[PDB]
């Protein structure tokens, strides 16, 4: 049970990395707008705010992500950068924030993980009756 909490967290992290990969690719696709305007476009607001929010969480693994965040704060000003990091700006992607949360997985998710792994490796497992009832 405690070992699958590590697996769930890494699986969520991989899903989060896929979301950030998409937002970096979006800022590259629409890099003309970034460089052209001085105001932040609506189409980019989700991407720019999320990348600034994520950088302090991810910058242990992805060192360049710090520099991306620092440049986006230099572009759209330090104050916007602070409103992003707390999501006071109300624009950071919700699924990503969930996937990088520090909370423990739900007990039913842990049990369901063990059920599926046990089934796949043909290992007898009996799940926690209390958790399966609470669900």
């Amino acid at each position: 049970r405690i070992r699958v909490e590590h697996i769930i967290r890494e699986d969520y992290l991989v899903e989060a990395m896929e979301i950030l990969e998409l937002y970096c690719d979006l800022l590259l696709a629409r890099f003309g707008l970034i460089q052209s305007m001085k105001e932040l476009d609506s189409g980019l607001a989700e991407s720019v705010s999320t990348l600034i929010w994520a950088a302090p969480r991810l910058q242990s693994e992805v060192a360049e992500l710090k520099i991306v965040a620092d440049q986006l704060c230099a572009k759209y000003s330090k104050e916007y950068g602070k409103l992003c990091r707390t999501n006071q700006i109300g624009t950071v992607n919700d699924r990503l924030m969930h996937k990088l949360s520090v909370e423990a997985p739900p007990k039913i998710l842990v049990e369901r993980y063990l059920i599926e792994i046990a089934k796949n490796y043909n290992v007898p497992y009996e799940p926690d009756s209390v958790v399966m009832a609470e669900a």
Binding site: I8, D11, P106, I108, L109, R112, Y113, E116
Partner: protein, 184 residues
């Protein structure tokens, strides 16, 4: 040569010296017995008795030397253990001292750090190889058109009798565990 190795060398030497002394006595019992027979045949009974007393004397000397040699061997065998087990104990003491030093200078926290850094620096070299290869790929794009490579693969697959169509862009536990994450 250690002071104990000297004593062992001398004990081993004394054991052999006694063993040689026993062999010399035995060979002289045989020599004196031959002289008794000669003296009896010549009727020299006084000389026969002198050889008889020598034969019996050297018979008994031989057993005393043989017995003493056995005892000195038993002692030499024990000081061999003491010499060897001393060498082993000093070597272990030396290993303990060496490892105590190296486990200080590179403790497990420092090893943990070094291994983390090692892994993270090869992640970076993978990122660098990838973008060298992407550059070279774009650099020589006109030398390898995609459609020509696809057609050569399809031609070689047709010759091999392989059914896989090469132009096209050619696990369930992972899929199910993903569905679980969506369901919660």
């Amino acid at each position: 040569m250690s002071n104990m190795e000297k004593h062992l060398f001398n004990l081993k030497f004394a054991a052999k010296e006694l063993s040689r002394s026993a062999k010399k006595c035995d060979k002289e019992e045989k020599a004196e017995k031959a002289k008794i027979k000669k003296a009896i045949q010549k009727g020299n009974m006084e000389v026969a008795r002198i050889h008889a007393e020598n034969a019996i004397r050297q018979k008994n000397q031989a057993v005393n030397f043989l017995r003493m040699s056995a005892r000195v061997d038993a002692v030499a065998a024990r000081v061999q253990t003491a010499v060897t087990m001393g060498k082993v104990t000093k070597s272990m003491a030396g290993v303990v001292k060496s490892m105590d030093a190296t486990l200080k200078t590179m403790n497990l926290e420092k090893i943990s750090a070094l291994m983390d850094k090692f892994e993270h620096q090869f992640e970076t070299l993978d990122v660098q190889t990838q973008q060298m290869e992407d550059t070279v790929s774009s650099t020589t794009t006109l030398t390898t058109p995609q459609n020509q490579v696809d057609m050569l693969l399809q031609e070689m697959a047709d010759e091999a009798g392989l059914d896989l169509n090469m132009e096209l862009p050619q696990d369930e536990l992972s899929q199910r565990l993903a569905r679980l994450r969506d369901q919660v």
